[PDB]
Amino acid sequence: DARTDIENFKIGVRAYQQNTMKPFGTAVGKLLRSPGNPRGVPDLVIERAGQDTLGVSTSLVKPFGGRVIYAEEMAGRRYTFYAPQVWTRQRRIYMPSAEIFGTHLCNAYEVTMMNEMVAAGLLDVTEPTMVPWEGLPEAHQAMWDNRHSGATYVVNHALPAMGLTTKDELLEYWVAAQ
Amino acid sequence: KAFAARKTQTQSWHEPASIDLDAVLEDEFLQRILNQLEWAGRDKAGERALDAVRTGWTQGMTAGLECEAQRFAEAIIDPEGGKTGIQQFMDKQSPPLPVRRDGVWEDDQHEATKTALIEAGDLLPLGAPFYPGVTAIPPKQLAFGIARDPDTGAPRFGPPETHERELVVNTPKPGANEALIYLLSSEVNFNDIWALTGIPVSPFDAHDEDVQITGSGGLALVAALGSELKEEGRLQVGDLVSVYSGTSELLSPLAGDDPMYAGFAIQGYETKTGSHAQFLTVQGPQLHRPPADLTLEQAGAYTLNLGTVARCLFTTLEIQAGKTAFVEGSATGTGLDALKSSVRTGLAVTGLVSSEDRAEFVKSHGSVGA
Amino acid sequence: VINVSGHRIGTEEIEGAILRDKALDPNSPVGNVIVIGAPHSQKGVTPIAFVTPVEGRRLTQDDKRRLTDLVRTEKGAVAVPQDFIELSEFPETRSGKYMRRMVRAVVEGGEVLRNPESLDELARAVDGWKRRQSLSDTQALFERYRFFTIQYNLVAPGKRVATVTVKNPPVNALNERALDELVIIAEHLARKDDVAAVVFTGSGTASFVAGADIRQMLEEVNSVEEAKALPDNAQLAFRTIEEMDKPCIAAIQGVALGGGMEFALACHYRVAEPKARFGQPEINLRLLPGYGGTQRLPRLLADGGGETGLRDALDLILGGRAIDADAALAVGAVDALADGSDNALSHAHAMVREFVRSGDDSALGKAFAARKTQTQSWHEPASIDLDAVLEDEFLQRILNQLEWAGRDKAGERALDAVRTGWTQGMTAGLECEAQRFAEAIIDPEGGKTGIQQFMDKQSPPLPVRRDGVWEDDQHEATKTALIEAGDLLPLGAPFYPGVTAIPPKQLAFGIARDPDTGAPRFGPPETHERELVVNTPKPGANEALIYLLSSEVNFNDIWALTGIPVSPFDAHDEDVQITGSGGLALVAALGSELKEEGRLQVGDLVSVYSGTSELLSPLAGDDPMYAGFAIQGYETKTGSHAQFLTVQGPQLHRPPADLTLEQAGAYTLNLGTVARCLFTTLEIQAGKTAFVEGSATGTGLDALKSSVRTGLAVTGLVSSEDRAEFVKSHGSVGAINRKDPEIADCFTPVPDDPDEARQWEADGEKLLDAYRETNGGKLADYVVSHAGERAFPRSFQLLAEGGRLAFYGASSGYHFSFMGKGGEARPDEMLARANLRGGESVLLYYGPGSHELADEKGLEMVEAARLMKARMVIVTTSDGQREFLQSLGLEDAVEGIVSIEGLKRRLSDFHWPDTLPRLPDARTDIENFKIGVRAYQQNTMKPFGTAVGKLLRSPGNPRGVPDLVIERAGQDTLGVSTSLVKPFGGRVIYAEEMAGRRYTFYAPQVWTRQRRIYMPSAEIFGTHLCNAYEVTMMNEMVAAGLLDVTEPTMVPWEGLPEAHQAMWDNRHSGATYVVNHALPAMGLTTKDELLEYWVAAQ
Ligand SMILES: NC(=O)c1ccc[n+]([C@@H]2O[C@H](COP(=O)([O-])OP(=O)(O)OC[C@H]3O[C@@H](n4cnc5c(N)ncnc54)[C@H](OP(=O)(O)O)[C@@H]3O)[C@@H](O)[C@H]2O)c1
Ligand SMILES: NC(=O)c1ccc[n+]([C@@H]2O[C@H](COP(=O)([O-])OP(=O)(O)OC[C@H]3O[C@@H](n4cnc5c(N)ncnc54)[C@H](OP(=O)(O)O)[C@@H]3O)[C@@H](O)[C@H]2O)c1
Incomplete structure (x- = not known):
């Protein structure tokens, strides 16, 4: 092995x-x-x-x-x-x-089809378990040890709050945080 | 002008040089190398090399060249020289070479370098707001991954929680078909781990860089666009985009068939850099408009796992409604995306788990059993 | 009852309209509805809709968007909820009644006992909502106007930069309201000491600003008072920007045309994308520049280029044609271009950064101080002799063309404005320009006619550009002059890639616009397809430059050369069209990204595929043919009927080695189309029957041979017995002479009268008898059609039960019919x-x-x-x-x-x-x-x-x-x-x-x-052509022998017009034609044999 x-x-x-x-x-x-x-x-x-x-x-x-x-x-x-x-x-x-x-990954056209299905409801994006920048090594290890805290992990780089839904909300919260 | 100048240049190489060879050799890094050669069994070759360098440097290129050729011929037939070095290279059992000067990552100097670069306008703090078209693109950035050991050159593979390190690397410059993106989030995929650990293949074998940054996907803002992306007019600086990790020979005739069969490679896993960083360069067709009704946490979370599941179910298997389906790992990652996706397609999906909690979890997602 | 900004509205009225979703959609996620008036910063009170969903249902954002349009269409846009708040449940009382007051009290913060714990879930949702509203009303990043957005950003502790972005979605045209907002924006930002500099730009990738709203000048301007408002409002905004006390940069990311060019000229510095184009096309509508073009453009270009600058400005106004970005920078119409990965907007903000840090030493500070001096000098009489410059011979050819096109009175108005300001100062010119512009709009023989013609696609051509004059008298004399210098290689001249210098001029066959009228000189190939001297192209990053040894002779060339049914000039803005779809060439130069690819190399012998697509689109993985596809030479400005050409990497292929040089670049378009038709669209199978139109020539022949080689019982349609024999000699079961007098008269479309139609169908009985007599009683399982309107109906009637017809053309006409x-x-x-x-x-x-x-x-x-x-x-x-x-x-x-x-x-x-x-x-x-x-x-x-x-x-x-x-x-x-x-x-x-x-x-x-x-x-x-992957599969089958290239009928360079005309008249001297450009002999098979025969000749 x-x-x-x-x-x-x-x-x-x-x-x-x-x-x-x-x-x-x-x-x-x-x-x-x-x-x-x-x-x-x-x-x-x-x-x-x-x-x-x-x-x-x-x-x-x-x-x-x-x-x-x-x-x-x-x-x-x-x-x-x-x-x-x-x-x-x-x-x-x-x-x-x-x-x-x-089967191996997908090509970029299938991604556009996928996002078409996500928009139409046919597919559902699992809500990720959000992790801070510093928590990334722990998230990797948790996957390796099969100790997942949730279905799937995502690392936060520069999202100022959770729940935001538009680019303009992102930029607005950034100037507000300063 | 060039041939006349080179003419006088060569004839000056036949005389002893006016630069102190011994002093420059006192360089801390040139010494780091020598100790590395000792560690890797090439110290004898190093001596022969520096002998010819030194000989020609003091007795003229002629006297050096004569010396270089003898050492080279000696090194070949040397049982402890070429007969060992060449067989080793050809059996893929060669010790690593040292790093380059610009590739020294030392743990104890990281936080100092980070803060110093942040004092200048050379590195944005992590999380820093970035307004495309307005904010100055920093020359440096922070990122996660693996680096070669400065002393031995070997990739510092290991368990993620102790070996995945935050590093100061360069911000990439996009090619003509590439975008530069500022990453808001990045997908946490299992291929990140295979690379970080080096199991079963070293990511360093596919490039010649002294550091590896993993990361296949995420949510980003377009920071810059290569000349041809601006010609395309699909993307735009300031666009909020999700990242698709596949890269291919976009200029191959075979693209009509499947980009997956045109020199394909997954970024972050089979490339030098990835999305576990502040900035990243990507090919055009890696960037997509997220579905509008998703939250920002959702948008950069699924394209690898769910894209793979979509090809697996709808392209490869071509699943038929009403039929039965058995999914592994149905309670996390791709298995769950497949469980959920097949259920919605109309199948009678059964899932495999390793805990009774996970079995109830998949039964709440519409499985006939677990 | 809530008072939404003085509008008295009942909450029940809003609730009911929301509840209608349940009456319209039996699967509505909506269950119960309560609407409350929540405190609002400005509206005073604004309606919020609290809704509990049906069991198991969630309230998607698609739902809220539907419930929002529901109150709109039912009551009115005033009674629209600002947000839709989902809840798990409402305060229910003992029996079930909903306590509206409890909800009203919490939302309003007032003092609310008789019910469960839902009350906590409300406050949580009201709290979250009242905070999103606080952030909306306090954010100072974005100011949102109807057709603009202002984005402020801190550069220095007391210096904000302002990004004004235009946004009228199809093309960012400026209608009156946008001018109204743009005046306010310019005046406001001018007074804000808070703002150190201003960057104007346009959203999207297509257009910065492509002009004033053309429809509005026609349908909403029926008096001079109405008309004068558009210059007066537009000039005031532009004067405000020009006279402002802060550097104002135009970051031009798309085209800047008409009013958009005048917008940019008003700014102090201009940085553009290399893809942006510039011009003043108002003359095309029998108008003139009215927002300052007749003053700032000739003044700006004359300061940079003296007498010639003035001339160049008169070209743009009187001719009304657009120029590329390299020309705009050269003439001095823009100051910088964003090369590489640099872009217009970022470049601009970097100039603002260096200006905040260095002040007047910055490039922007110098440009701003310089422009200040420049503007004030425009307010004095200009030093250049205008009347003298208008004696230029090309400016006269324009004036004579305006009269030919009915735009002379528009030209007179423009020169009046130009001359008025040139002698009396910009202010007098701007007053006269504005009046003349408004006079031209309402003028029945001006704007009212010009705009109408433009919209209905009935405008006469504009003149050609100064650099797009092809006069036949000059051709041969110019060709020799260029050859004698090192600027043009003689046709057929050897070219050693990587060694021979690339000439800047080249020879080619095509169509030029008439230098007198600007109309393309369409006509019959042998009389109108002409040899012209054009520029040797330069390849882009993903492109290659090739030196063409031979060239495919295809029908699409002819459709282009004759401008039938579409002008090739409608898809580009050049003064010359060059056709040619495929051929054999050498690689002469490779862009940066084709060198990265490693597949091609300078010196390679390659065959050319004519398909071009958005290689960088994500939709490539489906089919390049569905990603912005276009055939080169026919649907693009240049083609292979020339010495040199630029192509996308995927166009260049390795020919099968066992082919000769004559064959190599002779078949790709035709056999490739036939390949996709047979193997991809029809998916023909062995043992079936097939009917192939035009089986004796061109694509028809390719289809015949390919269908025979896949094991089908192919019969071919034919017009002469001599061709029927030729077709039979290719392994066909039979052929049919459509010109034979026994059946000739039946190959027609299907009449309108349904009774005539059914008789028409009977009249083809003799045809089907012919086909059946040769196919053991069977009809065609497959059909390949391309003749068109006068053969498709019968070709369809020949289909068997359950057959499949494909087609890729319609030469007789596009009005298809079938019983x-x-x-x-x-x-x-x-x-x-x-x-x-x-x-x-x-x-x-x-x-x-x-x-x-x-x-x-x-x-x-x-x-x-x-x-x-x-x-x-x-x-x-x-x-x-x-x-x-x-x-x-x-x-x-x-x-x-x-x-x-x-x-x-x-x-x-x-x-x-x-x-x-x-x-x-x-x-x-x-x-x-x-x-x-x-x-x-x-x-x-x-x-x-x-x-x-x-x-x-x-x-x-x-x-x-x-x-x-x-x-x-x-x-x-x-x-x-x-x-x-x-x-x-x-x-x-x-x-x-x-x-x-x-x-x-x-x-x-x-x-x-x-x-x-x-x-x-x-x-x-x-079906249509093919993608470049299908070409690799074609040559693959060719090399393997599963497909056979028909030997091309070689004709000389001078014979290409006759070869085209022979195809048109069906007077073919063979199967397909190929034009030789630099093949020294026939029968060669290698690249090294090519170069060796060249040296042997010289
Ligand atoms: N070829 C591609 O393009 C591609 C794409 C995505 C992923 N992958 C690969 O697919 C694998 C899964 O990735 P992932 O994102 O789904 O990781 P994940 O979220 O960590 O889930 C992995 C699953 O594997 C299950 N598992 C572990 N050992 C098992 C065993 N002996 N027998 C049955 N199930 C076992 C576990 O579920 P239980 O313990 O509940 O049974 C676990 O949930 C990885 O190796 C990944 O590299 C490949
Ligand atoms: N969609 C595409 O990508 C594509 C590609 C290639 C070609 N095309 C089009 O397909 C057509 C043929 O192209 P080509 O290179 O093969 O041209 P071609 O070499 O000139 O041959 C066309 C054939 O059509 C036959 N024909 C003419 N009028 C006819 C009629 N009223 N009824 C039946 N047959 C008639 C003629 O054969 P007989 O007169 O002897 O019967 C003639 O040989 C053209 O219109 C072309 O524009 C389309």
Whole structure:
């Protein structure tokens, strides 16, 4: 685990890449080379229920929509993969009766859609637990220790009072506080 | 003029220099480095370096160059030199280099520097009112994050409550597509912690700065705009805006597909600076108009957690009303935003918690169970 | 009873109006209401509305805003609550009665026993409220006028700075009331010793001040007394600012035009944004500068530039054209520009800061003392010979143009004002200017005509600028002169990026305005498309400069060159238009941000995509085509038919390497449009059939080959047998000759008489027999249309059951028509097809053709949309139909209803057409075509969209635009519905038997905004060009062989006009044309082969 022993964790990640993914991707890449796919990366992997190579396949398939499929019976077997390879690159695994879709943050257009839904009521902004500037380290630690005092934290930088709702209220309270 | 001047410059380098090399080497920081080289096993290389510097400095560049080449060839084949240093760099096990002069953060000198800069007009106190277009943008600012140890150069990672420190850093200048914003608040997200701790990846590996400021989101005022943002005419100095933390290659043809797939990076977590600071530079499309009916505490609180949940539920999963949904961590952060959002979408949402209080909490948000 | 500022009003009257929400909305969060008169600093007493909500309900700010407009519409704006205070409960007595006095006592602070503990919750809310009011009445930061805001800020312990911001929202125009406020503001701030300096600016990013209110000078000035008030008020404000004893900076963040330019000139220092533009367009309305322009502009520019300064000032007044900010600074009309991340307002305040700290040593203190001296000298006669300067030959070309455009008497008035002050002093000029301005306004042959023409879009052109004179006699002589010096490279000259100096002048093909009249010289390409000498552009931060080796020859060029149906000059302010959408070029220079990107490099061989968009908008992540999109060369001022060009980074692409140089920059516009049409819009599938218009040339050919290569049974429309053979040789199942005498006469629009229309449909029977004989009994599953008005109806008739037509053009005309296809469907299913989502805004027509209040299908549609959680507005025919619906308890579904009958009652000139009104072809009759379109917009759309919008406005849809329209087959309002529904994906759906009826709409409303129409048995999707990501997918498929570039028919530089005309006449000598600029040979395949053949030539 990267917490208890990070120097040996980094070595294991590198050995995986250098002795498995790089040699294997190179060989596959030479055969998939084409004017349409210069780097020779698979768009889709057909995995097989009778082995546990899913980590390699998710790590080799193209980033951002790369797909891995199973068609055979997977009952009674364990499969494994490296989590960041699927979510941070948003890769998809289609199985006969189940699907695992990686997802990572959002793009700026989806934010505008989100705020459109917040305006329309379809979404609801959880009211944050406000924290002073000095309380930020404690809020981080409270999250890390799973001792949340509320649903979600926000640090106050320069809000003169809580409850304000317009820019003009902000500036007005500032000149009043002096 | 330049070639004729350089001609006379080089021929003067063949004669001993008129500057005292020994005196400058007494500099406190140049000494800090030497001790750092000792700590990192490069003290021998340092000696060879200063030998060639000193040789050429007193016997002419020629005599120096001759010396430099011999030490370099010796250093390579040296079992304790290049054979160790190069293998170390190539196995990603190299000790850190020292910091730069402009990157020394010492705990005992922070509060003095803060107050001195505030005595001058060089740093605004925290919470200070800022009227865009009127208030002078200070050159310095306060912020939270991690810095490299001045003595060893290693990132001072650790538990947030003891290692996330308030620091005096520079106020950034926006590029042509960037805005400078004065932060009223900042989102407190878990990616802040992964960085501050260095688990499982060091944020310093993605940039070449001696300090890391985290922070992905918040409420801000527009303080300045790059030339192209003014051409766009969407934003305006003085606008109250919430911050979206995603950054991408806005000039890539691939933007039509998804900016997430065009050199994407989360600010504060995968960039040198973030929103846990007084001032921040952001790309244009990071700034948004908050929904009007929200309070100022609400406006800068949700764009990371709720934006992620929105993509997860409506883009990736494409959830269908009436269906069942199982959410982890349904009582805090993203889990709660997902719990709430799926309930409102019309699903039969069940939540996972680690306390009976949290189970009642999610049942009061419309869950069929906990 | 409360006395709201002497207005006696009962609290019950206010309470009742608030309670009406419960009678209008069965889901109202309002439960109980009490209204109290709370003490107010000035109003004396002001009504506060305490409300307890329904169980579980909260009182949103959208609710308070609705309950506020409710008292307004019911009683009056005087009886409006200042705030709405929510409470958990009211003081209830033994039995339940509400103790109004208890609440009144607490609010009023008086001495209130018989009831529960609610009393504490009131005080808490009254306390909180009474404190927000104290802060409002004591705040000294903002002074809020109707069209201005003053923001004070402490700079030194006794010196405040004042920021006066103009705010009249569309363009910050100054109407009379704003001049009234601006006088008071200037006089007040002048007397405040508290205020050390003043900074004027405008809100928003578009305009500082773009002029006086033009409509007001026409509709509210019917006498000289009324007219004289506008100069008199405006000049007094500007004189007050000018003569003030404090530095007054104009921070110009947008355009400063007309009165806004006169506003800035009144100030002591001027700092502007590089995007700001400046001018005096009053002459365009047969007026003149009336707020000081005829005095401060020639005086200011003459002090800076001597005789020439005066000349330059006469250019701006008599010509009336605007200049960019670099020119304004050069001539001396502004003093500084805010480069980089600096902005006008901050810059100004930094000058005030340095002035408070250094006084007269500051740059602002010197400018202020200097201006003082400057102003007083304007009050004496000027030293420059005016009559002599007016002998300048270009000033004469302007005067001769004013007579041509009917503005000579306006010019005479302006020179009179100029000359009066130039000889007698600013004061005499300002008096004469003011009188002449007011005389011109009321003058029937002046303002009354000019303003009318301007608003109705019937003004003649203004002259060209002094620097925009292209005379054909001069071209070849100027070209050689520039070439012989180091300023212009000969056409086809080698260019080694990073080595060859960039010439300042260049050659290009395009259209210039006539130097005598200012009218664009539109005409047939071979006679009117001309080679001109223009400037080599300079790239912006996100832009690149490229040296064009070849150039795509596309139809949009021709539409631009001929000014049909739209002038390319309406979208910019230059004196020359250059077309050209795509080509092959080298990279010559990269802006700061394209060097940061790292993708492009100086020297790269690249193909050009013609799409431009707001790269920095958040909406990029959706589709760049929906983020301020515009095609270069056609919808922008410059194009690729030139030596040099500037483009956005995303326009430049790496061509497939296995292509030749001729192909590389030859296909992107066409095949890219075809790509989005086939693979994105239609989503064509293998095994289906398809019908492709113009299959033998251009986009049609690209579509044919691409559809064949995806595995479809493509037949092509064709006009000559020789082309039908050519099309068949590309793997098609067949072709059809639209000119064959057996079917030629049937390719026409659908007549108005419904009986003729159904006969028209029969007359296409021979056509469908032809198609079917070649497709094993089947009709077209897909259709690609672009010919337009005279082929779309038949192309639609060729569709199969459940087929999908797309189109991206309409060469024959934009008046589209089609006979509906048999088939009925459920509103349920149709809204599903259109992917109706909860929260989207829907428009539904009720009682479409009749006055009978029963429309069973109409109610079914309401029920369908209601079940999908849709914000609905209903449009009925009559008031009886509207009142019929109001008894069906649809309040939880429809946000409102409006009847066409009601709009006709309230709007004399509102027109509801039975069908798209036919207009004269722009080819034949341009001016009357332009007149008819704006009649539709002004008398049909703008009224009907406003009424609908006001009922659909919500936070999620601030501008109240329908996301989808449920049309009705019994009417032909499709032109309205396609014009109203949001652009970029908007949808209209039919769910009823459309057979035997005609339906009409305006072509560009569907394709250029890519709106979709769903019908039971057919679908019409608009498509348009493509985004730069789709281009990467195109070249990707090209390299992979899934797509094939058609070899371009290469023509020389001198042949581009003929090549364009060949396309226009359908006299093609090949498939598509490309113009060669600097390709030394044909068959080259690498950049290094290009440069090596250049050296071999020299
Ligand atoms: N890819 C992205 O873009 C993105 C975006 C946002 C967040 N994240 C990541 O998602 C994770 C959550 O972030 P957050 O904002 O929601 O943090 P949070 O507010 O602190 O909540 C984390 C939740 O995890 C639950 N939890 C902890 N250990 C668990 C376990 N062994 N099994 C089940 N639940 C456990 C806890 O709930 P209970 O104890 O009640 O069960 C806790 O509420 C983080 O790792 C974050 O880095 C990623
Ligand atoms: N929306 C967009 O982005 C976009 C993009 C590209 C092009 N366009 C437009 O689509 C149209 C074609 O562009 P292009 O480059 O392909 O032009 P093109 O190369 O000149 O070909 C147009 C074809 O249309 C056919 N045609 C002319 N009149 C016809 C009629 N009354 N009925 C049926 N067919 C007729 C002709 O073939 P036959 O006469 O042999 O039958 C002709 O070959 C133009 O109007 C263009 O403005 C739009």
